[PDB]
Write a protein that binds this ligand. Structure first.
Ligand SMILES: NC(=O)c1ccc[n+]([C@@H]2O[C@H](COP(=O)([O-])OP(=O)(O)OC[C@H]3O[C@@H](n4cnc5c(N)ncnc54)[C@H](OP(=O)(O)O)[C@@H]3O)[C@@H](O)[C@H]2O)c1
Ligand SMILES: O=C(O)COc1cc(F)ccc1C(=S)NCc1ccc(Br)cc1F
Ligand SMILES: [Br-]
Length: 310
């Protein structure tokens, strides 16, 4: 159930995603998740619901359903806080909202820094994101200070490409390696190259959008649908599991961590029942064969930023 990180701590390979979980639903979703066995929650300041996630975590700690040591709580530094003097405050606001005194893991959410201010996506008058001149290496140094102040147990990265991971690994005076790179990964975007690179460096990969993010706000009717793919359905049927359960077990068997999102109690529970079956090697290779380099998480307004990863 857990994978060992290069900071010496163990991380549950299944967690609960919280992007798009409505603030009026996510407290119950996290309560239900902890009650049915989840011990890892994936959060972010930009999701605008950390307060409500925190109410759930705190209630389950108060009720003594779980111990703090048994939970693995992850959050992420938003792009408008990649300045030396803003990183600690950004982390502290997340801690405050989550009702925590430390994070198990804190990630640079995207490699690109944006102009600080109230807006999460500051734009120029023609719709391009406004960058910050801060680079990935100085942001990493700021992350390392959070470990040394006790605010976070591990630090990592998200949406970093091969060359950006390499830039951190080659950083002069590197003090802590990234523990995790959290990236989009599913049968339509299998990520074999970047996963093999990160794993070879001892960086654990977390697969986001493992179900293809059907609730992403920019979904279009014509788009591919993992959950409705009859080939994946057939694998599920053969194992008497749901398609979602196959899509969650797939990254687990690649030695990835996976963070499916749901606010539906029945689905939260279903999605956890993935430790009692095995996909065959042939099943695994067949799922890998569906790769189409189809990315659900990309954003035109940020594509000219110097550090846009894709
Ligand atoms: N690091 C980053 O840049 C980044 C980017 C994207 C995502 N993430 C993280 O990864 C998490 C997962 O990705 P995601 O939210 O994009 O999408 P996802 O987990 O691939 O899909 C979530 C969607 O699947 C539905 N669903 C869940 N379980 C289901 C089941 N058993 N059967 C049928 N439908 C099911 C959910 O519906 P209901 O909720 O209505 O049940 C929701 O609409 C996020 O929430 C976030 O924590 C990180
Ligand atoms: O980002 C998430 O976790 C999930 O997605 C989001 C979640 C939010 F709460 C707000 C925006 C996003 C978007 S639009 N993310 C895409 C995106 C952002 C920044 C850069 Br650089 C590139 C890029 F592709
Ligand atoms: Br970016």
């Amino acid at each position: 159930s857990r994978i060992l990180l290069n900071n010496g701590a163990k991380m549950p390979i299944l967690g609960l995603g919280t992007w798009k979980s409505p603030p009026g639903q996510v407290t119950e979703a996290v309560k239900v998740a902890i009650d049915v066995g989840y011990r890892h929650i994936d959060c972010a300041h930009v999701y605008q619901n950390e307060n409500e996630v925190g109410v759930a975590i705190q209630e389950k700690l108060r009720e003594q359903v779980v111990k703090r040591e048994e939970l693995f709580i992850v959050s992420k530094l938003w792009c408008t806080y990649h300045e030396k003097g803003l990183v600690k405050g950004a982390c502290q606001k997340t801690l405050s909202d989550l009702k925590l005194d430390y994070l198990d893991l804190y990630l640079i959410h995207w490699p690109s820094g944006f102009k600080p201010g109230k807006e999460f996506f500051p734009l120029d008058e023609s719709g391009n994101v406004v960058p910050s001149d801060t680079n990935i290496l100085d942001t990493w140094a700021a992350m390392e200070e959070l470990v040394d102040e006790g605010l976070v147990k591990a630090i990592g990265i998200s949406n970093f490409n091969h060359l950006q991971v390499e830039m951190i690994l080659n950083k002069p005076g590197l003090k802590y390696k990234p523990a995790v790179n959290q990236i989009e990964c599913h049968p339509y975007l299998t990520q074999e190259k970047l996963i093999q690179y990160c794993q070879s460096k001892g960086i654990v990969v977390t697969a986001y959008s493992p179900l293809g993010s059907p609730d992403r706000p920019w979904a279009k009717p014509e788009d591919p649908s993992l959950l409705e793919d009859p080939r994946i359905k057939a694998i599920a049927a053969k194992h008497n599991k749901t398609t979602a359960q196959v899509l969650i077990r797939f990254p687990m068997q690649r030695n990835l961590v996976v963070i499916p999102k749901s606010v539906t109690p029945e689905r939260i529970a279903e999605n956890f029942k993935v430790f009692d079956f095995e996909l065959s090697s042939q099943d695994m290779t067949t799922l890998l064969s569906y790769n189409r380099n189809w990315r659900v998480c990309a954003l035109l307004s940020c594509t000219s930023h110097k550090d846009y990863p894709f």
